[PDB]
Design a protein around this ligand. Structure first.
Ligand SMILES: Nc1nc2c(ncn2[C@@H]2O[C@H](CO)[C@@H](O)[C@H]2O)c(=O)[nH]1
Length: 360
């Protein structure tokens, strides 16, 4: 009995010398890490090849080459801020033409995570973000995503487990947090959590909406402590103290306050760190100086996530490579962070226990 990837067992880790290896050989090791990913936006999760196929299926950029398409739409070379990312992402919504492309996107998103060695996958998406460009029905968007994920998961005999979060977001046409919350609870059978992304806002002004979702048994993980241009850390305090989140999207600015470090440790909150995203968006000065190292050393629970493989033309194993090369993270660290990720995942505990017994 065998599968394509020979996943790494924690007993085997000491026999692997990464110092011997070329980048190519390292990536074969990163692929074999049984990965649990908590923060990936399905609606911006795709390969370059998939993205360009969409643009050409609907004849959207006839005067542009394949490479010019990627430069025009995506964020692979990075930019100046989170604000610049959010506007760029709005252009990408050109591919949300119909429910068939959305299903295909979902299918290819799941399949590539499987190929990359992800065993536990919490995808998240924004109904309103997917719906606005072509005025789609969020009920049918959701139907397409659920169908695409289910079809690939069943084809793969559940060798990758996938769960879904709903994002209420700010920064695009037809954004609506309340409506997203209602939609999330309407489909709570399919959603394991609720999130806020886009522009980083102080979410205490939506206290009522988040209380209602949380109290309904849908746990919260929101984007907070990402955007370094904000003049204080109020969004982090509101996420932790008002929203009572179990996890924080990014949360890297927690590193700037000993009070917040102590608070997140005390409350067993996990920071869903997205290294490449932070660097490309200039929320970290460089990978050498990425806060994850200080946070890891400080005893804070952190995990590795890819965020937007489509926007950055990267995948999860790249984020692993960068942490190893620039910040000397080890296989033992990576295994530990993935077990934390498993523990803090919003997935059904029965499923999570099988994954734990199978890989950890
Ligand atoms: N703040 C923030 N929002 C993001 C990021 N990646 C995707 N999103 C948002 O998530 C939604 C799509 O899932 C859109 O509102 C995107 O702008 C990110 O790295 N930071």
């Amino acid at each position: 009995l065998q599968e394509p990837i020979d996943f790494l067992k924690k007993e085997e880790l000491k026999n692997i010398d990464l110092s011997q290896m070329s980048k190519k050989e390292r990536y074969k090791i990163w692929k074999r890490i049984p990965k649990c990913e908590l923060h990936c936006h399905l609606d911006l999760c795709f390969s370059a090849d998939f993205f360009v196929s969409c643009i050409r299926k609907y004849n959207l950029q006839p005067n542009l080459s394949d490479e010019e398409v990627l430069d025009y739409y995506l964020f692979a070379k990075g930019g100046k801020s989170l604000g610049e990312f959010v506007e760029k992402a709005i252009k990408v919504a050109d591919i949300f033409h119909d429910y068939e492309v959305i299903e295909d996107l979902a299918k290819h998103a799941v399949f590539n995570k499987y190929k990359e060695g992800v065993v536990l996958m919490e995808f998240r998406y924004s109904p309103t973000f997917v719906a606005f460009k072509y005025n789609l029905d969020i009920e049918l968007i959701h139907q397409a995503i659920v169908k695409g994920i289910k079809e690939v998961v069943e084809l793969l005999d559940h060798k990758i487990h996938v769960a879904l979060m709903c994002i209420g977001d700010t920064g695009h046409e037809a954004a609506n947090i309340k409506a997203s919350a209602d939609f999330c609870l309407k489909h709570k059978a399919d959603f394991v959590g609720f999130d806020h992304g886009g522009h980083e806002v102080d979410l205490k002004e939506y206290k009522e909406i988040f209380d209602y979702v949380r109290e309904s048994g849908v746990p919260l993980s929101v984007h907070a402590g990402e955007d370094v241009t904000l003049p204080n850390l109020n969004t982090l305090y509101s996420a932790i103290q008002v929203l009572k989140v179990e996890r924080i999207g990014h949360g890297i600015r927690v590193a700037e306050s000993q009070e917040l470090i102590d608070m997140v440790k005390e409350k067993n909150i996990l920071l869903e760190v997205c290294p490449i995203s932070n660097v490309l968006l200039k929320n970290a000065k460089s990978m050498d100086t990425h806060p994850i190292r200080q946070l890891y050393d400080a005893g804070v629970k952190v995990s590795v996530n890819s965020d937007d493989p489509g926007m950055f033309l990267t995948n999860i194993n790249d984020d692993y490579e960068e942490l190893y090369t620039h910040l000397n993270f080890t296989l033992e660290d990576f295994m530990k962070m993935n077990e934390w990720a498993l523990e803090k995942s919003f997935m059904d505990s029965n499923i999570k226990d099988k994954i734990k017994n199978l890989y950890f």
